[PDB]
Structure 1
Amino acid sequence: TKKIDQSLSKKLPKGTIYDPFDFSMGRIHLDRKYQANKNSNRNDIMKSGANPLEFYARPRILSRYVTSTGRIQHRDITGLSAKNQRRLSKAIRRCQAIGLM
C-alpha cells in the first residue's frame, strides 16, 4: 500500500526548521498531547476585552459558547475570566428570554 493515514504522518510547514526527531512517532504523539485551542484568544471576542453583555441581541456570537442543545459551557471549557463568564451567561439567559436564542 502506498497510502498512510494523516494521523500517522506529520506535514512540516514551509519556512520552518526541523530536527530528525520531527519524523518520528514521538513527535506525532507529542503534538496530540500538547494540542490545545490556544489560538482561540485571537479569535475569541470574549477574550479580547469586549463586554459580553453587549452581545445579548447577537445570537450568532453567543451561540459559539453553548452546546448543540443550548447548554452554556462551563468556564473550564470556555477559558474565560470569572467576570466574562458571569457576564456571558447573563447575556445568554437574557437572549433566551427575549426570544432570539
Structure 2
Amino acid sequence: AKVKATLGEFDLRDYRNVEVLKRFLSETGKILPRRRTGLSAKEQRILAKTIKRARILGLLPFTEKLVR
C-alpha cells in the first residue's frame, strides 16, 4: 500500500502542499521510510528536505501522540 501510488503528479519540492505531504507522514508524525513511500533514493531525499521546511513553517508536525 505504497503512498506514491495513491497520488498522481505532485511537486516533490512544494513545501506548502500540506495535503500531499501529510500522506508521507506516519500516524506518529514521523517521516515514512522508502518502503512505505515507494520513492527512489533521489526522490526521498527531496521529500524529506521539503517536509522539514513545512514543519518549520508550522504546516506539518514534528511529532504526534500515538492513539491506540
**Bigger radius of gyration:** 1
RMSD value, Cα: 1.9
The equivalent residue for 1:75 is 34
Q: Does 1:59 align with 2:23?
A: no
Q: Match for residue 7 of structure 2?
A: 44
Q: 1:51 to 1:83 in 2, by over 3 A?
A: farther
- The number of residue pairs the alignment matches comes to 59
Stretches of 4+ aligned residues off by more than 2 angstroms: none
Q: C-alpha distance in 1, partners of 2:56/2:35?
A: 25
- Give the TM-score taking structure 1 as reference length: 0.51
Matched AA of 2:38? G
- Give unmatched runs, 5+ long, in structure 2: 61-68
More helix by percentage? 1
Q: Which has the higher contact order (CA 8 A, sep 6+)?
A: 2
TM-score normalised by L of structure 2: 0.71
1:44 alignment partner, SS class: coil
Q: Which residue of the partner structure matches residue 66 of structure 2?
A: none
